Structure 1
Amino acid sequence: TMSLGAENSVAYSNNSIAIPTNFTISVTTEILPVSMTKTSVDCTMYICGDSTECSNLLLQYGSFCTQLKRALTGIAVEQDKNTQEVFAQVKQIYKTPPIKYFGGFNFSQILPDPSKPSKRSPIEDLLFNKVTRDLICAQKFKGLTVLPPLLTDEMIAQYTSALLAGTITSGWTFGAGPALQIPFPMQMAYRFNGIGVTQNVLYENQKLIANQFNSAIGKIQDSLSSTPS
C-alpha cells in the first residue's frame, strides 16, 4: 500500500512558538516546455505518393488539403510567438561586466562562457547534451518536414544573458523601466526585506550566504547529470 509520508505531530500549545535560528539557501530547478516542433505536411506526397492518376481523384476532396495545411501553419506561427513572450521580454540586450566580483557569489556556471564557440553557460551545456538513412530524412520523403524555428539557439542564449546581466547588476528595475545600477550585496538586502527578515541578517552573514549559494548552484550541475529523468 502506497505510503503518504512520515507522521509528524506538531506539538500545539497556547504559549508555544518556534522561531528559526538559522537559514539554508536552496536552489531548486524547474522544467517547463516553451516551444514545440514546427511541422508541415504535403498532401500530394502523403496521400498518393509518386503517382498521377491518384492525384486526379484527390481533386474531388477540395477543401481538405488547404484546411489542414493552414491549421498547421497557425501552430508554426504560435511556436514562434510562444518564444517571444517568454524570452523576449526586455528591449535592451545587456552585457555582463568584465570584473565578475559580485560580493562573493560565483555565477560562473550560469553566465555565458566565452571560451566555447556557442557562448552558453556550463549549466546550459549540460541541458543540450541530454535533450536529444536516418529518421529525420526518412519522414521528409513522405511530406513530413520540420520547419526551423525563428529564433535560433544562439539568439535565445543572448536573451538569457540579457536577463542575467540585469538580474545581477540590477534588480527589479530593468523589468519596470530603465535599468538602475545597484550592488548585488545591497540587492539581496532588499530581497530579504520582502520575506520578512531585516537587512542585518544578510550583511552580518554575507560570507556564509555566499558559500551556501555557491554550494547550492554547484550541485545543480551534478543533480541534473546524475539523475537521468
Structure 2
Amino acid sequence: SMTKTSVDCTMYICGDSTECSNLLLQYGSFCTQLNRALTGIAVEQDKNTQEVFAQVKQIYKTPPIKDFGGFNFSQILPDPSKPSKRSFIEDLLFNKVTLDLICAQKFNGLTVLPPLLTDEMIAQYTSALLAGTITSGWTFGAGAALQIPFAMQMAYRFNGIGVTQNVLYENQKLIANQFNSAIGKIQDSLSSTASALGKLQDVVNQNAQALNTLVKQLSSNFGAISSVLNDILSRLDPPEAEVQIDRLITGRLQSLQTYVTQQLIRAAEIRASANLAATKMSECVLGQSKRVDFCGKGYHLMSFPQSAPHGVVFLHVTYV
C-alpha cells in the first residue's frame, strides 16, 4: 500500500478566501473528479492491504509449547513481552524504515488518512498466517486448518521439489541448524546495513517528494502579480483582482490534476505490486509453488510473511 492522501480544493487552491471560494465553485466538476479519484486511490489502498493480508477466515494462535523438531521461530513469532505484539525481525524492519514539513502539508490542506488496519492488526494477521503455516501447513489456505507436525510438513515440502522425504528426516537436526543460522544471518544483515528495505523506503520517499513538490508549487506565480492571494485581494479592486485570482486557480488546479494523475499511475504500479504480493502469499505462504524463481532463488520449500511499513517481506526458504 501507500500513504492514503486526501486534498481539499478550498484549503489548497484558495486558502481561506471567500472571493476565491466563489471564483472556484464554478470549477466544482474538476474538484469533485479529483476528490473521487483520490478517494478511489485510498479505498484501493485499503483493498490492497485486505487482499494481501486478510486471506484467512480465523485468527490462529501458536501453542505455548513451541517445539517444532528443532525449528525455533522465536525471531518471527510475536513476543508477548513487547507492548507492540510484533516479532524481533518485524521490530527491526519497523525501525529501519523512517517516516517540520508534515505540519506545513497539513496546514496547506494535504492530509494523510490513517490506514483502516493498524500496524497491530496487520501484525496479528501476519501472526495468524505464521501460526497456520507452522501448525497446519497449506491446508488452512484451502478449507478448515488441519494440524500437522512441522517435521511432516517439511517432509511434504521436500517431496514437492522432487527430493525423497527420507533426506529431511535423516538430516533433521542439520536442516534445523541451517534454517536457524539463516535466520541469524537475516537478523545481522537487517541490523547492519540500511540498504535492505530499499523499495518501501523509496516508495515513502516518492510520496513525500510528490507532496513536497505540490506544496512548493504554491510559490509559482503562474503569470500572476504574486503567489499569495491575500496581498492580491488587499492591493487590488475586484475587476482585475478576480482575473489574477482565476489565473492562479487555473495554475494550482493544473498542479493538483498533475499530482492526481501521477498518484493514479503510482497507485496502478502499487496495485500491480499488491496483486503480486497477494499471489505470493497465496502460492508461497498458503502453499508450495513450482514456478521457478517465483518464491525465491532455488527449489522453494515455504515462505513467512512479515509486516513492514506500507509493505510485506517474504522470508523465502529455498533448497539449493
Shorter-normalised TM-score: what interval? 0.7 to 0.9
Per-residue deviation, residues 125-171 of structure 1 (Å, max 9, x unmatched) = 00110111922221111110000110000000110011011111111
Instruction: Determine the C-alpha separation between the residues in 1 that align with 2:157 and 2:146.
Output: 16
Per-residue deviation, residues 9-34 of structure 1 (Å, max 9, x unmatched) = xxxxxxxxxxxxxxxxxxxxxxxxxx
Gaps spanning 5+ residues in structure 1: where?
Answer: 1-34
Q: Find runs of 4+ consecutive structure 1 residues off by over 3 angstroms.
A: none
| C-alpha spacing 1:60/1:159, structure 2 compared with 1 (3 Å) | same
> 2:156 maps to which residue?
190
CA-CA distance at 1:73 after TM superposition: 0.5
Instruction: Determine the C-alpha separation between the residues in 2 that align with 1:99 and 1:59.
Output: 64
| Aligned-partner SS, 1:145 | strand
Instruction: Determine the C-alpha separation between the residues in 2 that align with 1:143 and 1:195.
Output: 54
Instruction: Determine the C-alpha separation between the residues in 2 that align with 1:129 and 1:164.
Output: 21
Per-residue deviation, residues 79-108 of structure 1 (Å, max 9, x unmatched) = 000011010001011000000011001100
TM-score for the superposition, normalised by structure 1: 0.82
> Which of 148, 158, 165 in structure 2 is aligned with 1:199?
165
Matches within 5 A, 1:59-74: 59-74=25-40
Root mean square deviation, CA, Å = 1.4
Per-residue deviation, residues 28-52 of structure 1 (Å, max 9, x unmatched) = xxxxxxx011001111111121212
| Aligned-partner SS, 2:5 | strand
| Aligned-partner SS, 1:83 | helix
| C-alpha spacing 1:63/1:196, structure 2 compared with 1 (3 Å) | same
Instruction: Determine the C-alpha separation between the residues in 1 that align with 2:41 and 2:121.
Output: 21
Instruction: Determine the C-alpha separation between the residues in 2 that align with 1:98 and 1:67.
Output: 53
Q: Quick check: 62-71 or 155-164, which moved more?
A: 62-71
> Which of 41, 51, 68 in structure 2 is aligned with 1:85?
51
Identical amino acids, percent of aligned pairs:
96
| Aligned-partner SS, 1:191 | helix
CA-CA distance at 1:60 after TM superposition: 2.5
Whether 1:218 aligns to 2:181 is no
TM-score for the superposition, normalised by structure 2: 0.59
Per-residue deviation, residues 57-94 of structure 1 (Å, max 9, x unmatched) = 11222311111011100001000000110100010110
CA-CA distance at 1:225 after TM superposition: 1.9
Instruction: Determine the C-alpha separation between the residues in 1 that align with 2:53 and 2:140.
Output: 14
CA-CA distance at 1:174 after TM superposition: 0.5
| Aligned-partner SS, 1:132 | coil
Instruction: Determine the C-alpha separation between the residues in 2 that align with 1:126 and 1:147.
Output: 25
> 1:132 maps to which residue?
98
Larger helix fraction of residues? 2
